[PDB]
Design a binder for this molecule. Structure first.
Ligand SMILES: *C/C=C(C)/C=C\C=C(C)\C=C\C1=C(C)CCCC1(C)C
Ligand SMILES: *C(=O)CCCCCCCCCCCCCCC
Ligand SMILES: *C(=O)CCCCCCCCCCCCCCC
Length: 370
């Protein structure tokens, strides 16, 4: 009353949770780090994703419908970083307090919300593609089509949102956390309403995808055993340059799938630790969930949205191709060599004169036109 005080942790527009109050304040330096640190991720991430969008949307050698996913992901993880990063969290941090609106805090999360599920759920979609290009027997393969793709996207979106929109209507809720500088979902209060949402969040916005992801990269792994007989047995029926077109086109997609695995490898590790912390604080030793118990790990997890680019930039071919032509200075520590792209190119050579036995071909692979 007339210049209100209580402690550091007091935040005028947001109802802190008692738990975050029962501790003593973190030092002036962690906040700044927490600032500086998540500033770096605003940059890096809105960098990569931006580029990534920019390349994959312009570079002609990449208009493959399957990639519109890459786009989507580059997109999600961008937004995320944009918002989740600067300006909100970094300032809250530089000023040990969350300057922005209550709704500011409500959104900050929702965003991350959508865009956490987006990235993850999306990988699934990709993984679906790889299965249609590698797990199913050579004979039955279906490459991605501008149509299917765009539907999936939309399935994704609706979804991504659905499971994070809950809190925006009181089922669960978003407030401050850790050092009260960022914002996040409510995993403390164990009432019937909050707890109910929380579990859907885990099963629906997270496991739900994982099941699918795993379901593929197994069905694929196991169907490779079979591939060597198919790449050797239909390696008899062909010329010396159509076999390379078959192995090169089978040696490449492979990589794409290998890459996306290393991503899901990425996503899985950065979120789960915090994720674990979450459930704990929702089911076990709440006394444990100390400041660092939530904040130090929620960082690694927000960070999860800025690796893909770096990862790609050390392993995707066609990409590096485009990097180097407009932005080589980035590949400064992982330079390009004309070699890598050969494997691909030979996938797109044409047909008049080579392979025509007395058992003529017509394959079934997305060529319908009105
Ligand atoms: C930094 C602010 C954050 C991370 C706010 C919100 C996060 C979510 C809605 C997260 C949902 C999930 C994550 C991060 C990992 C496990 C699965 C999940 C759906 C509970
Ligand atoms: C070759 O080694 C490429 C990586 C070079 C590492 C240099 C970057 C270190 C992290 C600094 C982050 C940007 C700082 C922005 C200016 C303060
Ligand atoms: C080609 O150069 C590909 C890019 C290589 C990545 C450069 C690494 C800089 C990333 C900064 C983050 C590392 C800080 C250490 C914290 C674990």
């Amino acid at each position: 009353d007339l210049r209100d005080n209580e402690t550091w942790w007091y935040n005028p527009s947001i109802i802190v949770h008692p738990h975050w109050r029962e501790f003593d304040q973190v030092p002036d330096a962690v906040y700044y780090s927490l600032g500086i640190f998540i500033g770096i991720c605003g940059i890096i991430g809105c960098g990569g994703n931006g580029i990534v969008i920019y390349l994959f949307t312009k570079t002609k050698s990449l208009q493959t419908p399957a990639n519109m996913f890459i786009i989507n992901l580059a997109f999600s993880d961008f937004t995320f970083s944009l918002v989740n990063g600067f300006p909100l969290m970094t300032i809250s941090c530089f000023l040990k307090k969350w300057i922005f609106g209550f709704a500011a805090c409500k959104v900050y999360g929702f965003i991350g919300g959508i865009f956490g599920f987006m990235s993850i759920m999306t990988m699934a979609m990709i993984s679906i593609d790889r299965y249609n290009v590698i797990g199913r027997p050579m004979a039955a393969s279906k490459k991605m089509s501008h149509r299917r793709a765009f539907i999936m996207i939309i399935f994704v979106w609706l979804w991504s949102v659905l499971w994070a929109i809950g809190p925006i209507f009181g089922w669960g809720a978003y407030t401050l956390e850790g050092v009260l500088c960022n914002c996040s979902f409510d995993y403390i209060s164990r009432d019937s309403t909050t707890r109910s949402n929380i579990l859907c969040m885990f099963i629906l916005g997270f496991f739900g995808p994982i099941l699918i992801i795993f379901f593929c990269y197994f069905n694929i792994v196991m169907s490779v055993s079979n591939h060597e007989k198919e790449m050797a047995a239909m390696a008899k029926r062909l010329n010396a340059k159509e076999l390379r077109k078959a192995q090169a086109g089978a040696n490449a997609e492979m990589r794409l799938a290998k890459i996306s695995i290393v991503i899901v490898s990425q996503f899985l590790l950065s979120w789960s630790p915090y994720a674990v912390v979450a459930l704990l604080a929702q089911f076990g030793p709440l006394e444990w969930v100390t400041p660092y118990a939530a904040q130090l790990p929620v960082m690694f997890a927000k960070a999860s949205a800025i690796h893909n680019p770096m990862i790609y930039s050390v392993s995707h071919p066609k990409f590096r191709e485009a990097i180097s032509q407009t932005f080589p200075w980035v590949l400064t520590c992982c330079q390009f060599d004309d070699k890598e792209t050969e494997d691909d190119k030979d996938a797109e050579t044409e047909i008049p004169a080579g392979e025509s036995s007395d058992a003529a071909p017509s394959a079934d692979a997305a060529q319908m036109k009105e």
